[PDB]
Design a binder for this molecule. Sequence first.
Ligand SMILES: *[C@@H]1O[C@H](CO)[C@@H](O[C@@H]2O[C@H](CO)[C@@H](O[C@@H]3O[C@H](CO[C@H]4O[C@H](CO)[C@@H](O)[C@H](O)[C@@H]4O)[C@@H](O)[C@H](O[C@H]4O[C@H](CO)[C@@H](O)[C@H](O)[C@@H]4O)[C@@H]3O)[C@H](O)[C@H]2NC(C)=O)[C@H](O)[C@H]1NC(C)=O
Ligand SMILES: *[C@@H]1O[C@H](CO)[C@@H](O[C@@H]2O[C@H](CO)[C@@H](O[C@@H]3O[C@H](CO)[C@@H](O)[C@H](O)[C@@H]3O)[C@H](O)[C@H]2NC(C)=O)[C@H](O)[C@H]1NC(C)=O
Ligand SMILES: *[C@@H]1O[C@H](CO)[C@@H](O[C@@H]2O[C@H](CO)[C@@H](O[C@@H]3O[C@H](CO)[C@@H](O)[C@H](O)[C@@H]3O)[C@H](O)[C@H]2NC(C)=O)[C@H](O)[C@H]1NC(C)=O
Ligand SMILES: *[C@@H]1O[C@H](CO)[C@@H](O[C@@H]2O[C@H](CO)[C@@H](O)[C@H](O)[C@H]2NC(C)=O)[C@H](O)[C@H]1NC(C)=O
Ligand SMILES: *[C@@H]1O[C@H](CO)[C@@H](O[C@@H]2O[C@H](CO)[C@@H](O)[C@H](O)[C@H]2NC(C)=O)[C@H](O)[C@H]1NC(C)=O
Ligand SMILES: *[C@@H]1O[C@H](CO)[C@@H](O[C@@H]2O[C@H](CO)[C@@H](O)[C@H](O)[C@H]2NC(C)=O)[C@H](O)[C@H]1NC(C)=O
Ligand SMILES: *[C@@H]1O[C@H](CO)[C@@H](O)[C@H](O)[C@H]1NC(C)=O
Ligand SMILES: *[C@@H]1O[C@H](CO)[C@@H](O)[C@H](O)[C@H]1NC(C)=O
Lengths: 97, 49, 48, 435, 48, 96
Amino acid sequence: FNGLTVLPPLLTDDMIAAYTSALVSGTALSGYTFGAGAALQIPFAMQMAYRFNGIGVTQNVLYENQKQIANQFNKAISQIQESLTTTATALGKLQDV
Amino acid sequence: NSIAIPTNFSISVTTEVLPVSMTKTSVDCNMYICGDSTECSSLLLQYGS
Amino acid sequence: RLQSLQTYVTQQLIRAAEIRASANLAATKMSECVLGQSKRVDFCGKGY
Amino acid sequence: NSIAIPTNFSISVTTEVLPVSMTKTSVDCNMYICGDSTECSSLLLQYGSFCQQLNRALAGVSVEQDKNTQDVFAQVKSIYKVPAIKDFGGFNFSHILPDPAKPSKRSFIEDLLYNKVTLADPGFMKQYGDCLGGVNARDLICAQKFNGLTVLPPLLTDDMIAAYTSALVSGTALSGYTFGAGAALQIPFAMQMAYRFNGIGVTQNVLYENQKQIANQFNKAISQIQESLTTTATALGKLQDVINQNAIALNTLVKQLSSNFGAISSVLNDILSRLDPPEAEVQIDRLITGRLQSLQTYVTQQLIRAAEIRASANLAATKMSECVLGQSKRVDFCGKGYHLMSFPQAAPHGVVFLHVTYVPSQEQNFTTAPAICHKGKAHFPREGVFVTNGTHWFVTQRNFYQPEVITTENTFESGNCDVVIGIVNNTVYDPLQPE
Amino acid sequence: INQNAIALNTLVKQLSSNFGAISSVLNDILSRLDPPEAEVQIDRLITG
Amino acid sequence: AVLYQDVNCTDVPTMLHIDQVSSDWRVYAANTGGNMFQTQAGCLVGATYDNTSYECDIPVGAGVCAKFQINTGASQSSILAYTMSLGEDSNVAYSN
Ligand SMILES: *[C@@H]1O[C@H](CO)[C@@H](O[C@@H]2O[C@H](CO)[C@@H](O[C@@H]3O[C@H](CO[C@H]4O[C@H](CO)[C@@H](O)[C@H](O)[C@@H]4O)[C@@H](O)[C@H](O[C@H]4O[C@H](CO)[C@@H](O)[C@H](O)[C@@H]4O)[C@@H]3O)[C@H](O)[C@H]2NC(C)=O)[C@H](O)[C@H]1NC(C)=O
Ligand SMILES: *[C@@H]1O[C@H](CO)[C@@H](O[C@@H]2O[C@H](CO)[C@@H](O[C@@H]3O[C@H](CO)[C@@H](O)[C@H](O)[C@@H]3O)[C@H](O)[C@H]2NC(C)=O)[C@H](O)[C@H]1NC(C)=O
Ligand SMILES: *[C@@H]1O[C@H](CO)[C@@H](O[C@@H]2O[C@H](CO)[C@@H](O[C@@H]3O[C@H](CO)[C@@H](O)[C@H](O)[C@@H]3O)[C@H](O)[C@H]2NC(C)=O)[C@H](O)[C@H]1NC(C)=O
Ligand SMILES: *[C@@H]1O[C@H](CO)[C@@H](O[C@@H]2O[C@H](CO)[C@@H](O)[C@H](O)[C@H]2NC(C)=O)[C@H](O)[C@H]1NC(C)=O
Ligand SMILES: *[C@@H]1O[C@H](CO)[C@@H](O[C@@H]2O[C@H](CO)[C@@H](O)[C@H](O)[C@H]2NC(C)=O)[C@H](O)[C@H]1NC(C)=O
Ligand SMILES: *[C@@H]1O[C@H](CO)[C@@H](O[C@@H]2O[C@H](CO)[C@@H](O)[C@H](O)[C@H]2NC(C)=O)[C@H](O)[C@H]1NC(C)=O
Ligand SMILES: *[C@@H]1O[C@H](CO)[C@@H](O)[C@H](O)[C@H]1NC(C)=O
Ligand SMILES: *[C@@H]1O[C@H](CO)[C@@H](O)[C@H](O)[C@H]1NC(C)=O
């Protein structure tokens, strides 16, 4: 009633989530080679091996304890949801603005 | 003469939130100021840009 | 009323500058942490 | 079970523009407000001290702009003479270094960059006869000076700025990046470029095998940069935008005097020509308040723009330090692909970076296995993975294709063949064959 | 530190100006003028 | 030292209004003993020009800076104007 209006954003919520879906899917298929150029197919087990190589750890340790690493990763991913549900202060900046 | 070497490892996942944008707004002077008034609109026009 | 509008516009400009800085930081982190592996300390969490 | 390995590479050159500074201005209250009026000057003096803050802020902004320019451009205190020859192992450094044919002190690309973007009013040497004291069509610049609005020239001239770029480019061709961390170290360019390929995980031998192709691609990209710049007119947008913003702000501030606010007339001479001072003070007060409000708004906007320019200049200086005086492994920080080297180029109120990168292409299809079992023991590769043609096995790199026979010095032995999944039968070359 | 101190001192010393009124002091204005006339004098000081 | 920005100091008398100022400005309005030299930003009055180059102390503009000298043997107590120095020169040559 006083000339104050709010304009909608150019990008919708569905379109934004498409970028995240493309980014996550690209990582599982190429790692980070698609960021510097074209995509390069690679098995995830071998892709994760060289991630351990970049931190100064030998490649053989991943193949010896692959199941434990996968179980820990899955447990952490599952616990992320529980931690988000149990708390209400992590998402504070967006509410503040 | 001593040294400590770890023998086990663990995988941890953490979260982080960063704002990217805020809301977009617009303001109309002729409506916020001098609401439905021709004389006030003329005075505001005389006031300047 | 003009003074109030000017104050609101100035505050909005300052907030926009702050949001611009935050968005630049977020974009840099996305580029250097998702499309690659970073060895910078405490840039992509705690640890390696 | 499959893997893709590129077999060819290409050299690409990209450009990037960052603003470094804006114009410097000054404002006089006694001239912008109460122009040639003793009574109005006395009233403004009675009003209070509302103008020293504006002058202090403007002086701080000017000093900040000068400091930003100095920090961005002046980083190394060593002037290196341009070499007489401009051909280092097939690489043509002709469009980046100044041409001794004419003492222009600028390279070929910098002249195009300067001529592409225009300026409002250069020189700052306008006298009587060039303003309304002589004859004009009421130009904006002379109108600004009639109300106390002036523009100050930058401390560093265009020729001096280009000297820093000439020294930086020449230093790279003679030492690489060793001069950034200390004294200069002479090195052939062919050997200098070899270790740039070594930092991106590619072996040194590939450069010597295809040096001519790399040089030709580099020269072609450098030549095509000029054509791309000529054919387009939107890459240099930020500098034009900031120049236009400053000009628009100054013009709006100049033209704001036409408004009379709540008084009877914008002109101050007629008010004192028909009303007594006891009645004229009320008329003058509102004009003074409005003009002071406009000045405050302009100063606040200038401060915000100065802060933004400061942030941009800090980013540009960091990029110059981390990309020209060295090699950076940060992703998408010096272009697209694997960064090799960068070349700085001067721009009006900004800087232009030329990034040379390494981009693999021409992928090929192959199959791979995790490990190799020789005799009850598992072998893991040291640098690369295992590839296969026609019931064979080899060890090669990832950024380039170069098969090699599997030996005991290429793979370390650890563990058994049971825990590892996907391991297959294969033999390992025995070093003790001729024995 | 000097900038903060200068800003505070300038804000403190800005009260000496009377703007378009007859006196910076507020006690004397209410000591010689009726409230209907004193309101106009007070308004400009408040705005400044 | 007074710098008259945005004017050619060949035309100071028609700009400074010599006939309507005190004699102190009449001193700073006459070209005697090389007290006026044209720069890129303006024309400085009241200072002496110098050759060579030194580090910048008092910024002026367009590559010109100023400094104060305290000389006893030459009895010089004026301001100097000079062009700032980019830096020292090196003689590194190329070799293959
Ligand atoms: C996957 O890619 C690999 C790349 O190495 C190929 O492996 C080679 O394949 C070629 C072609 O079949 C083989 O070459 C043949 O080798 C024999 C001669 O070997 C001499 O030299 C080796 C040392 O290098 C000694 O150990 C050996 O004792 C011999 O002294 C001969 O069988 C062949 O000679 C034929 O060609 C030559 C040249 O044209 C003629 O002059 C002869 O008359 C004759 O026709 C030939 O040279 C090579 O040995 C393979 N290397 C290995 C390590 O096995 C794979 O074939 C390829 N797979 C597919 C499916 O393409
Ligand atoms: C140190 O690292 C080793 C592996 O290198 C860990 O040993 C194994 O850890 C796994 C984790 O899942 C244990 O599995 C669990 O075991 C029991 C089985 O009854 C049960 O709690 C779960 O169902 C799960 O399967 C495994 O037993 C364990 N092995 C041994 C011999 O202890 C070890 O846990 C690491 N140390 C620490 C302190 O975490
Ligand atoms: C894959 O890389 C190889 C080199 O490792 C490239 O092969 C050679 O590429 C050069 C590029 O200049 C070709 O030169 C050109 O050849 C003809 C000669 O008539 C002509 O077009 C030009 O004058 C120039 O000299 C060269 O011929 C070529 N060699 C072969 C055998 O093809 C190859 O081009 C790269 N692949 C791609 C798709 O770029
Ligand atoms: C890799 O080679 C080993 C060693 O020869 C294989 O293990 C033996 O394979 C033979 C047949 O080649 C069987 O008769 C033996 O019983 C195996 N010995 C064991 C299991 O201890 C092994 O199978 C090979 N891996 C393959 C073919 O995937
Ligand atoms: C300031 O005045 C001097 C003296 O007249 C000018 O010096 C010459 O001016 C002419 C005419 O413009 C030029 O063609 C010459 O190149 C100048 N130099 C010499 C050594 O003769 C000077 O140009 C004037 N400056 C301005 C900005 O008008
Ligand atoms: C390195 O540069 C020197 C000159 O500084 C080259 O020496 C020339 O060698 C050629 C060989 O054909 C002679 O004809 C010339 O007379 C030499 N001098 C000059 C001034 O050209 C030397 O060849 C270069 N080295 C390499 C490997 O190219
Ligand atoms: C590689 O070869 C496999 C063989 O099964 C095929 O399925 C796959 O599409 C090929 N990949 C490419 C990129 O051609
Ligand atoms: C200073 O420079 C001027 C202009 O080139 C020259 O005439 C003069 O001789 C120089 N004085 C010296 C070097 O003492």
